[PDB]
Write a structure and sequence with these properties.
heterodimer, A: mainly beta, rod-shaped, B: alpha+beta, 5 strands, isopeptide bond (chain B), ubl conjugation pathway (chain B)
Chain lengths: ~15, ~80
Amino acid sequence: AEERVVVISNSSSRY
Amino acid sequence: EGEYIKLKVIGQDSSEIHFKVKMTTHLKKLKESYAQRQGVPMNSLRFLFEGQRIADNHTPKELGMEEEDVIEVYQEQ
């Protein structure tokens, strides 16, 4: 398996 | 700007997915992403750090985690 690295990162609303 | 640390998450089958998180990240976000990628419900899994249960609102800072620390995933079941 290849290495796997996952990065864990309102007035305009219309509804 | 604080730095990401990279954690290794080891599954029941010894597969690995690494996650970058900040020291203040609530680890529910890692749990949810892992479960999504495994295609199973988050509540079917328990996530351990040094054998102790990782809470949704635990942070790496609270757990004393560092670069290259390991999280193990077991069935809840």
